[PDB]
Every structure is written in structure tokens, then in C-alpha cells.
Amino acid sequence: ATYTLTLDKLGPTVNPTTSDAVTFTATVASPDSTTAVFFTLDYGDGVTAETTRTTTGALSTTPTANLVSAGTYTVTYASIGTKFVTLRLYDSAVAPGVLLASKTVPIYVEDSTLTATLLQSGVPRLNLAFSGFKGRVSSSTANRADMWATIQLDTAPGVFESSRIFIGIAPTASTNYDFVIPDQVYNLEGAKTTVLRIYDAPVGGTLLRTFTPAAANAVYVVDPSKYVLTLTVGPTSVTTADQVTFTQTTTEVSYSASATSPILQWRFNWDDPSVVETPLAYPDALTAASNFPTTATA
Fold first, then answer.
1. Which ranges does the record mark as transmembrane (predicted)?
2. Which of 84, 157, 181, 183 has the greatest number of C-beta atoms within 10 Å?
């Protein structure tokens, strides 16, 4: 009489807010008891009661395919915070049957009143302290309570949430309140899904908001040593009367690590006080939205 219950939220992919409905996914796998049991789902909101018992069918070692279908199992939460959903398995549809098994899953309901965003001024460097991160919060309601922020560098198993940093009160409504983040050191070259979590308590509590940058502008850690630069200038040994020629076409920049990379501005300085260095400019035939090329480009 062993039962393995897997419960999760199929939708939405992100943590649900107050308004959006939540749909669940539940599977049951019995290693030895191949029979039929009745499942009930409690949403834990308090307003809605426990759902009626419903049959599961003949169980087996492999889990049943989404025992909780779309149906009317969706539920929207009127309050933010940590809710608990419970899937319970009983022998008989009548009440009160024998409670064969129970499983509990926590759902985090953020609030739509507060919008949090994370902006990075620069591009992070591998194994180098990056201090370009910045957080911003805007609350539609006025007099928002004092907040705290944590930043998770990546979703990799080894990465952990950072210690919470204090974010002051946000009295004025519908305004952008700004704060800084302590410098974070990355460990792997490539794209990372850095996330920002705004909490209402320093030691733990409700999850006010979770923000993740769009895949169009995602955090990318690049190795400075991986860049390849081929600079061609005039003759090395000359006098003050000679002419030193720097060829833009022959001079080339590239990034050998990967095809996808954030773009960078190339700037050239003659190391002479009389003439200032060239202004910032992208490589040839590249715009701001474009990616830094891998092949050799002028």
C-alpha cells in the first residue's frame, strides 16, 4: 500500500499573482498496490472547500498522466503570501474513508501592486566583482512597507540566494524608488538567468515579487581574455615628422568563446595629448541590438 504523489502548478510558469488563476498537475504512482483510489484537492485559500472525491483508475509503477486535468480545478487567490495545496488519496469515494495518502505543495502568490525591475549598467566579467547591478521598485499603492532584496545569480544547483539587503520605505505611489546591490562575482562564462526577489521580511516571510529579465536582454558573463584583438598601426619607429597610419579595415575584433555575446564599443586612443581619442562606436555593420561577432570582423 505504497503511494507516490507528485504535485505541481502547471500554470502559470511564473509564481501566480492575485489576479491570475492557478492550474495544478498531479500524478500518482503505486509501486505495489495496483488498484483504484479517490483523490481530493484542497487549495488552502480557506474560502473554497475541499473538492469532491474523484476516482483515479488502475494505478501502476509509472505515474498516471495528469490525474488533475484542466476541468474546474483552477483557483485564484485573493491574498498574497505562501499558500498550501494538498492532494489526498482515499480508499472509498464515500465519507469518511481511509486516508491512504497525503501530499502538500507550497505556492507563492506575489502582488501585482508592486513592480520590481533589475537593470545592469555594465556587462559582468568572469571571476570579477561586478557592481553594475541596480534594483528599482514601484508600488501603485502608497506607503509600502520596508522591503528587502535578494539576488540569485543563476538557477544552477550550486548557486544560492544572496543575503537580504534592506530597501527603504516607498511612501509615494507610482514612482521609481531605486537601490543598489552589493557586487556579485560570477563563476561560469555564458548566459545566466539572474533573478531578483523582493521580500517583506529580513528573516523570512512572504515573497512580495520575483523579477527575471527578458531573454532579449539577459545577463551574460564574458571572459575578457577570450576576446581577440588585432590592431594594425603605422611604422613602430618613426619621428615627429613621419605619418602613422591606423587601418580600420585591417584592425579587427572578435570573440572566440561563443557566437552569442553582448556588443561592445571599440575606442582607439593615439596616446597623445593634442588629439583626443575616438568616440565610442560599434564594430562594422553592427547596431545596439546586434550581438558581438565571433568571426574576425573589421
1. none
2. 181
